[PDB]
C-alpha cells in the first residue's frame, strides 16, 4: 500500500546534509554499514542486547538503537527515531523477517534503499519462478506431485530430504513424519523439483538505476550443516548410519567462475532485470542474486533468487576477485550500496533509488 | 618454425613509446588486461558479438578488436591490426585453442610473452610426461593396457571414469559408448594412471628471466562439473542414481598449503625450470602452474601442468595470501606479467621475455 | 620453571630502540614476518638448508639464524643470538614441537609473545577439555571405552578412523594394526568421541591485554589427505576400495560465518578467555583459535583448540573479510601480533604481552 | 573553576560506544573534522548560516549545531547538545575567541582534548614568556620602553610598527594615533621587543601523554598582509609610498627545516612539555606549535607559542614531510588528535588527555 | 685511490640476503633511511648523543652505530661494522664534510651508492665550473678580478656580499674585515660573479644507470638567513639599519616550474649527465640538483650543483607533484635511491650503482 510520493515526502522533510544509512543488525549489515562510513556515511544500528558485540568490536555503527527484540523493529516508535536521525534504511533478509513483510510493504514509513514491492517477489514461490521462467532462465524442472518423479528430485517445504522414485518419496516423508521433523500439512503442500548436480554458484549482481547497468560484484558457494558435513563421511560410514540431511545455511566460501561463462552470467542478469522492469516497475533496484547450479553442460540453472541483498556479500566484505577490477579497489556489496546512495543524493536523483 | 629474431625484427619496428598489450578476450584476460592498466598500459582485448560485456562492464580494455568468431584471430588481417598497435600479446589456454597451436608457432607473427616453442610441451601429454618426470617430479603411475590394472585408476580421452580392475574398466567403457560419449577409437588410446587420492593444490610460479628467480603467486583448487556436485549428494541417495562423474571445469576456489611444504613447493617450480631450460630453451618464461594433489604422506603429485597462465588464477585476481608477501600490493598473476613487459622495456631486455 | 621476572629482566638488558621479532621459519612465519615489517620492525627468521628459500624469495625476513636442524633451536647458543639482537620471540605450533614445550617453560631464556604457561594447556586433551568445559563451551560427547560407543564417534590416538559400534570399533583397531600403523599400546589409549557432523569454522581469535578486548580476526576450513580427496571419489567407486581415511592437514580454505552466529562466536571467545585468566594467570594472551563444527541445530561444537596462533591463519595473510573491518586494511593475524608488541613498547606495558 | 572530576563525571554519563569528536568550523577544523572521519568518529561541527557552505562541501560533518552567532557557543543550551551527542571538544583560537576564555576556563562543561588551564598561558605574553623564559628558551630580547631602544625593534599592542631608535617610535606611534588606528591607550602599553631577522619556521609539536612523548607533526610560515605584499614592491617604489606594515595572518606556506637543527627542534618541544609540567599540571596536552624565527647563526629564537592547535596545521591537511615519516601516511595533526583520542578510548585512560 | 674492483670485494664478501642501507644521522637521512624500509630494507644510522633523538622518535632506523663524535666515521672500527652489517652507505653533504672527502676518496672502504669520483668534481669550483661549462650550461658571468666588475656581481668566500662597483667592493671588504668575518686571505681568493636576478629552481634529478635515463624527482627553492629575513623588512626600515645580507641555508619551499620549461629542464640533465661520463667515468649515479636560477627571458642559470643528494629533497619527504607522476606513489628521493639499490641486487647489476 505504502506510495511512492508518500516516501519521497517523508524524505523531503530529512536533512539533506545529515543522511545515515541504517540497517538491522544482522545478515549483512557488517559490509552495509562498514561499506557506508567508507563513503562518508554515518550509520545507524538497530539492535538488541546479547546481539550487539560484533557492531561493537567492529566499530562498524555510530549510533545503536537498542529493541527489545528485534520484532519491535516494525513499531513507529523505531520508526520515528529512524526518520529523526535521516537514515534511508538498506534492506536484508533479517531485516524483512524480523519486520515482517506486510508491515514492510504498507507499514513501515521509513526510505528505504531498493523498490519495495518487488520483495515480495522473492518471498512467493510462484512469483519467484514466474520472474525467473518469464526472464527466460533456467530453472529446476517442476513437478506436481509424487507420482510424477521420474528421476533424482529435491523436496522442498516451506527439513529437505532427495527421492529417486514415488517409493521413495513417501518412505522418506513417512520418517519425516514419524521422527518430528514434518506435519502432514507441510508434505501436503510438497515443492518437489528436478535435483540438479552441479556447481554451485551464488553470483551477486548489482544493478545502477543512475548508470542503467547491471554489474558483477562477486560470488560465493554455500556452506550448509548438515549436508556439508554429511558428505565428508566416507562413503562405507555413511552406510552404516542412519542420518537425514539438512541444507542449513551456516557460512560461505568463495569462488570465482571459468572467465568464458561469464558472458552467459551477465545475460542472466541483463535478462532478469530487463523482465522485473515490466513485472514490478520499476524493477531490480541495487543488489541482487542468482543461486545456481552448473552443469556438466556448462549451463546454469537457478533454484533461488534474492531481490536484495544476498548473506554471500560476506564472503566478500574485503573485496573480491569481481569487486577489484572496476577500480584495483576491496571493494564490498555494502559499498557499493552506500556509493549509489551517495551519488543520488549528488547529482538529485534519490527517486530512482529508494521507496 | 617462427623464428626468434623473426620475432625481434617485428618488434623492432614498434614504437617502443606506446607498447599495449594485448590478448583474447576469455579465459584468464580480465586479470591480463586489469594488471596491464595498473602497471601503465594501453590494452587491446579480442573479442566478438556476443562476448564482450564482461570486458565493457569491467572497464578493463581501451581498445577492443572485434572479429566474426574467435577462429578468425589466426588471420592476417588480425596480426596486421596487432602490430599497427604495437602489441605485445599474452597467451593463454582459450587464445591458443582458438587460434591453434600450429597457428601459433609458425604463423601468427606478433610478439609473445613467453617462450613460443614450450606451448608444444604443454599440448602433448608424452611432451609433458617427459618434462615432469625428466624434471625429477612425482607423477601419476601410468598404466600401458587395462590388463595392468591392480588399483584404483583414473582413465582419460583427450569423458572420463574410474576403474578398481580390468573388468571393471570394460563394463564402464561400454556404458560410455552405450551412451553416445565415447566412441570405439577414443578407448583405442585410453590413457590409465593411478587414481591420486588427496587434496588439490594448482600451484602459480612466475619464472622473471630478469631475476633468474622462481616465484610463487598463488594457489587454488578445482570446482568441476558434475562431479563436485556429484560428491556432495549422500552415498545412500547416490546408489539408488545412475549417473558417471565428470570433471568439466567450471571455477576456483582459493587455498593456501601447510607453510612447512614451501620447501617443496619451490624445490618443484626450480626442477621443472631447470630442466625446461635444458629441453626447451630458454625454458619456462613467466607463468607456469603445476596441479597436484597432495597425498596423507604430504608428497605433491602432479597431474597436469600449464605452460603458460592457468584459469586458476582467476581466483586471486584481487591479490591473495602468497602475492601479497612482496609489497603489501593485491597483486595478481595477470599484473605480475605486466611488471616484467615494463622492467624489461625499461632495462632493454625484451628479448629475454618475448618470442 | 620460567619466571616472569626471569624474563623481564632480560628484557631490560634489551635495547629497546632496536626490539625486533623473531620466529622459525615455518607454521605461520611468513605473515608472522610479514606483519612485523609492515609494522616497522626488523625480522629474525629461525631457518635451515633446504628450507630457507620460501623466506628469502618473499624478502620477509632481514635476519637469518641458520640452524643445523630445527631441533638445535633449545642450544644456548641461538637463545644468545636472540637475545644479542633484542628479539622477542612469536611462538607457534612447530617452534614449540622442535624446541620441545619442556625446553620452552623452563630452559628458553629468550622473551616470548603471549602466556608462556598456557602453551601447555593446548598440548594435554586433559587440560583442554578441562578448559574448554569449565569455560562453558560445547564439546564432542566423551567416550570411556569401546563398549559405550552408541551412536558415530571418531577415535583419536596421540591414524584416525570412524565407528558406529563397539563391534566395528574392533575391526577398524585390528586393521590398523594388522597394516602397521598402529601398535597395541596406542589402542591402549585410544580417545574415543562424538563425531560431529556439521561445517567446520577454524575461529581464529585475538586478545589484547592492552584493550582488554577479544577480537575476531578470521576463519577457514581445513582442507586434509587423504579425506577431502577420499570424500571427492563417488560412493559407489569408494566401495569398491579398500581404503581407510586420515586426516593430515595439508592446507586451509577461507570461510565466513551466518552473521547472526557471530554473537556465539564472539561469547565463545569471551568465556575461553574469562575462564584461562582463573586457570592459568593472565590467561590467554594475543592469538587463540577455536576449532568448531556447526551442527544443523546452529550449535558451534569445539573439537579443538590451539593457545597461540593457528596455521589457519595462512588463509587470510593478504587481510581477510574480518580484519578488514576494523580499519579497511589487509591486516593479517601476523600483522595484529607485531601492532600489539609496538602499541605495548609505546606505552611501556611490554609486561602485559610477554612472558 | 571547572574541575577535572567534575569534567570525568560528565564524561561519565557519556555513551562510551557513541563518542564524537565536535568542535567550531573556524580556525583548523577541516582537519579536525577530517582527521576524526578518518580515525572512525562521528563529527559535529558548530557552525552558523553564511559560514556553513565549507563544511557542507568538504563533507567533513556529519551533525552540524548552528548558533545565531559563535558568540552563543558558551549559551548552556549549546552545551547540552554536546553533551547528549557525547562529544569530546576539541579546542582551537576561533573557539576561545567566540566563547571567550573566562567562559571556558568554569562556565564551558563539555570534555574538551587538552589541558584546559594551560590555554590561559598562551593567552597572556606575562605566562607565555614566563613560561619560555624558565623552559629555557630563546626569545627576543625585551624592551620596558621607547628610551630603552638602542637596535631595530618591533612594537606589538594587544597594528604594529618597526623603530630603529627612541625618536622614531615616537614618530611612528604619532603617525598611527593620527590616522586612528592607535588610542593613546593602546600605546600606553606598548610592547617593544627585539626584531629578529631570519627565517620563519613554526613548529607543530604533538605531546602524547600516552607514549609521553614530544613529536614532531609539521611546520609552516606565516603568509601575512599587508607586509609580504607590501616586500614584493620593488625598494624605488616603496620609498615613493607612504605606507605603514601589518601583519594581518592571512595563510601560510609550507617549510622544511634544515636537518641538522632537529636536534634544537626536539629539544624545544621537549624543554616546553618539561616546564608546562611544572607550572601548569599536567602540562602540555596534544598539540602546540613554537613560532620562531632561525637568524644566521642557526639558533631558532620564539616569538610566540600555542598551547593548543595552531592555523599553520593547515599547511599539511593532506599531510607532509614529517608527518609522513611515522607510517607513510598522508597524516595531519587534526587525525593525529583523532587517533590519541581511539587511542585513550580503546586503554581506558581518557583521563590521560580530558578536561 | 679506493679502486672499484677494491670494492666489488668487499661486498662479495657481503652476504646478499641481508643488504641493509647506511648512511649518517643528517642532511637527508631521514628519507633516505625510510626511503629505504618502504623498498625492504633493514637500516643503519650512524648517530651521536644529543643528535640521535629525531631518528628515535621517526622511528627510521633499526640500527644505530654511536660514535663520539661525527668526525669518527672515518675510523677503521666503524668501517668494520659497517662491513659486518652488509650496508651500502648512502652518501650525502654532512656525510662527506664529517669524514673528510679525502677519507671516502681512498681511506673509507666500504660500498657506497654512486660515483665516489666524481664527489671532488661538486667540491671544487674549477672542476664544478668546468663541468658545467663542457656540459653546454648556463653559469654566471666569472669577475677574474674587484676591476673588472661592471654590474651587480655576488661575492663568494670558501660570509658573502653584493657590489655594483669596484669602489663598493672594497668598502663592503674593509667592513666584512674590520667587523672580524673576514680575513684578509679570504678576500685575496674572492670569488665574483653576475648577480642573477630571478626565481630559485633547485632542480632534483635521478640518474638511472639500469634503465640508462634521467628522471625529475622535485624542487625546491632555498630558505636562507639572514637574506629571506632581512628583505622582508620594509625598504625605509633596512635604510635605518646597519645590517648585511648572509645566506645560510636553515631550510626550504616547495616550488613547481612553468610546465613549457621542463623541455629545458630535462636538457639540462641530459647534457650534464652526457658530459660527465666523459669527464668522471661512469659519471652522475643516481641524485644530482642543478640550482638555478630563471631570469625574466625564461632561461635558466645554475650557480651551484650538487653530485649527490642535495638537502632539498626534504622539502618532499612524503612526495611531490613530479615524484607521483610515476605511479601515483608518495615517493621521495631516498625511496627513489634504494628502489635502485633494490632493483640492482634482484638484476645482479650491483656494479653499475657501487663504488
Ligand atoms: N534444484 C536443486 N538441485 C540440487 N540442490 C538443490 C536444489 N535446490 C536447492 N538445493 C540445495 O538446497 C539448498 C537449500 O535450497 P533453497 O532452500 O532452495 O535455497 C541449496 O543451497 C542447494 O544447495
Ligand atoms: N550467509 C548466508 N548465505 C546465504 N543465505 C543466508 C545467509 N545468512 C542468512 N541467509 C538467509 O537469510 C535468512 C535470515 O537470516 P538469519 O537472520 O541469519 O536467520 C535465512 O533464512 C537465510 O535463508
Ligand atoms: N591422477 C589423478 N588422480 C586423481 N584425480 C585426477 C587425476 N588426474 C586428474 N584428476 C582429476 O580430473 C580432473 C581433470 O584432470 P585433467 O583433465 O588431467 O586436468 C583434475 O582436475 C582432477 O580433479
Ligand atoms: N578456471 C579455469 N581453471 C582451470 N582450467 C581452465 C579454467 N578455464 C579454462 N581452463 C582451461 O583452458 C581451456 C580453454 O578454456 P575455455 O575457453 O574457457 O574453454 C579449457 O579446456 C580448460 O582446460
Ligand atoms: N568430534 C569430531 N567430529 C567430527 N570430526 C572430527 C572431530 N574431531 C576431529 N575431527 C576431524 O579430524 C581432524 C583432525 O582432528 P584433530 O586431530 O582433533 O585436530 C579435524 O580437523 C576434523 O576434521
Ligand atoms: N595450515 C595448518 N592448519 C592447521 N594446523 C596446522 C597447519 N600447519 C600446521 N598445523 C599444526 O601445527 C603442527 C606443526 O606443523 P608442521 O611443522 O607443519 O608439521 C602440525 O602438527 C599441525 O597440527
Ligand atoms: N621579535 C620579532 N622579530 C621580527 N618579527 C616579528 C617578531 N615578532 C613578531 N614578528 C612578526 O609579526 C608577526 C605577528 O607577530 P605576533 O603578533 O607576535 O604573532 C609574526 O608572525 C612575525 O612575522
Ligand atoms: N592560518 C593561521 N595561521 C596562524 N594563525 C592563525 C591562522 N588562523 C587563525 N590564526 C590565529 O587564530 C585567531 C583566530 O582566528 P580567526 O577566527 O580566523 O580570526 C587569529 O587571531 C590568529 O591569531
Ligand atoms: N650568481 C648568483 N646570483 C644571485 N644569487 C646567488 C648567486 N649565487 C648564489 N646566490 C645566492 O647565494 C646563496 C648561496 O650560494 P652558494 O653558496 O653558491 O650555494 C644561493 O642559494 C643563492 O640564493
Ligand atoms: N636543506 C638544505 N638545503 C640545501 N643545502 C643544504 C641543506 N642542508 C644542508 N645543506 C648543505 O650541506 C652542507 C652540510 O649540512 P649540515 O651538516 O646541515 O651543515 C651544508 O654546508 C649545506 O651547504
Ligand atoms: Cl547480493
Ligand atoms: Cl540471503
Ligand atoms: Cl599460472
Ligand atoms: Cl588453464
Ligand atoms: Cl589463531
Ligand atoms: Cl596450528
Ligand atoms: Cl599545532
Ligand atoms: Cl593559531
Ligand atoms: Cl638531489
Ligand atoms: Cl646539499
Redesign the interface.
Known sequence: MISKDEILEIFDKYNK??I?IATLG??????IL?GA??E?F?TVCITMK??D??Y?????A???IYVDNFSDIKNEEIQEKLRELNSIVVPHG?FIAYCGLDNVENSFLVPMFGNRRILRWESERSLEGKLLREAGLRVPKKYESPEDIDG?VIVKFPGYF?A??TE?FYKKAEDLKKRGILTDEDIANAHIEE???????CIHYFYSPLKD????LGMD?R???????????????????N?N??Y????????????????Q???MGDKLVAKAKELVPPGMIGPFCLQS????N?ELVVFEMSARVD?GT?????????????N?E?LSMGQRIAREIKMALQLDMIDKIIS
Open positions: 546534509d545529515e545515515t544482522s545478515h549483512t549489515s557488517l559490509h562498514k562510513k567508507l562518508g554515518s546479547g546481539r558485540v560484533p561493537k568490536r567492529f566499530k562498524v555510530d549510533k545503536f533479517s533424482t532427495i529417486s522414485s521413495e535435483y540438479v548436480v552441479g556447481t554451485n554458484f547497468e547491471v554489474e558483477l558457494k556452506y550448509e550443516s548438515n549436508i556439508d558435513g554429511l558428505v565428508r563421511i566416507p562413503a562405507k560410514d555413511q552406510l552404516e548410519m542420518i540431511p539438512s542449513v545455511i551456516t557460512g560461505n566460501i568463495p569462488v570465482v567462475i571459468r572467465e568464458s561463462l561469464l558472458p552470467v551477465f545475460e547450479l552448473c552443469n556438466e556448462l548473506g560476506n564472503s566478500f566484505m574485503n573485496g573480491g576477485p569481481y569487486s577489484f577490477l572496476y584495483g576491496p
